[PDB]
Design an enzyme around this catalytic site. Structure first.
Site, PDB file in Angstrom:
ATOM      1  N   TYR A 141     -49.892 -32.081  -3.569  1.00 51.08           N
ATOM      2  CA  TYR A 141     -50.087 -30.562  -4.089  1.00 51.08           C
ATOM      3  C   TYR A 141     -49.602 -29.515  -3.104  1.00 51.08           C
ATOM      4  CZ  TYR A 141     -54.615 -30.040  -1.768  1.00 51.08           C
ATOM      5  OH  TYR A 141     -55.406 -29.712  -0.547  1.00 51.08           O
TER       6      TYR A 141
ATOM      7  N   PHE B  43     -51.708 -21.438   0.276  1.00 45.34           N
ATOM      8  CA  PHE B  43     -52.921 -21.506   1.120  1.00 45.34           C
ATOM      9  C   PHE B  43     -53.197 -22.906   1.334  1.00 45.34           C
ATOM     10  CE2 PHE B  43     -54.068 -21.157  -3.374  1.00 45.34           C
ATOM     11  CZ  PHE B  43     -54.796 -22.302  -3.573  1.00 45.34           C
ATOM     12  N   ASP B  44     -52.671 -23.963   0.803  1.00 44.41           N
ATOM     13  CA  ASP B  44     -53.112 -25.322   0.886  1.00 44.41           C
ATOM     14  C   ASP B  44     -51.921 -26.126   0.339  1.00 44.41           C
ATOM     15  OD1 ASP B  44     -54.616 -27.518   1.423  1.00 44.41           O
ATOM     16  OD2 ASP B  44     -55.830 -27.306   0.000  1.00 44.41           O
TER      17      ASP B  44
ATOM     18  N   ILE C 121     -62.201 -27.732  -7.693  1.00 47.16           N
ATOM     19  CA  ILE C 121     -62.128 -26.921  -8.529  1.00 47.16           C
ATOM     20  C   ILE C 121     -62.223 -27.266 -10.112  1.00 47.16           C
ATOM     21  CG2 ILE C 121     -61.325 -25.116  -7.077  1.00 47.16           C
ATOM     22  CD1 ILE C 121     -58.885 -24.845  -8.407  1.00 47.16           C
TER      23      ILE C 121
ATOM     24  N   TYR D 113     -62.101 -20.159  -7.959  1.00 40.65           N
ATOM     25  CA  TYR D 113     -63.188 -19.643  -6.924  1.00 40.65           C
ATOM     26  C   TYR D 113     -63.947 -18.250  -7.351  1.00 40.65           C
ATOM     27  CZ  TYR D 113     -61.206 -23.155  -4.125  1.00 40.65           C
ATOM     28  OH  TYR D 113     -60.645 -24.430  -3.589  1.00 40.65           O
TER      29      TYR D 113
ATOM     30  N   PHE E 254     -50.854 -24.169  -8.852  1.00 38.10           N
ATOM     31  CA  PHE E 254     -50.707 -25.698  -8.135  1.00 38.10           C
ATOM     32  C   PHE E 254     -49.701 -26.184  -8.738  1.00 38.10           C
ATOM     33  CE2 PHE E 254     -54.717 -25.672  -5.487  1.00 38.10           C
ATOM     34  CZ  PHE E 254     -55.380 -24.929  -6.129  1.00 38.10           C
TER      35      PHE E 254
END
Length: 107
Positions: free
Chosen positions: A26, A36-37, A56, A82, A99
């Site tokens: 992902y 961010f990831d 999440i 979030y 994502f």
């Protein structure tokens, strides 16, 4: 809540069950495209148990709609990510998250 837009089809046969270990690659970005990831940047497939609030809410809901082999864009609204607080330093308040998720296999 969460939108799943298929990029590449899975087998439409093998779907995650509640509590099952799922393996994905992902990348997560803000709607401005800021990353961010990413498990792809780490070079390792990412494992999690679906339906256990280990990720999440958008993932628990959205990945459950994917079949093995599927690649899709998951757009999670704040309530499925979030929220109003966000994640200080990482995710601003009231952020929608995008994502790119590939469902590699179930365990």
């Amino acid at each position: 809540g969460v939108t799943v837009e298929t990029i590449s089809p899975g087998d439409e046969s093998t779907y995650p069950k509640s509590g099952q270990t799922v393996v994905v690659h992902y990348t997560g970005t803000l709607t401005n495209g800021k990353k961010f990831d990413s498990s792809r940047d780490r070079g390792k497939p990412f494992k999690f148990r679906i339906g256990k609030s280990e990720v999440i809410r958008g993932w628990d809901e959205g990945v459950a709609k994917m079949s093995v082999g599927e690649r899709a864009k998951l757009t999670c609204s704040p309530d499925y990510a979030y929220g109003q607080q966000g994640h200080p330093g990482v995710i601003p308040p009231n952020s929608t998250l995008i994502f790119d998720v590939e469902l590699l296999r179930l365990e």
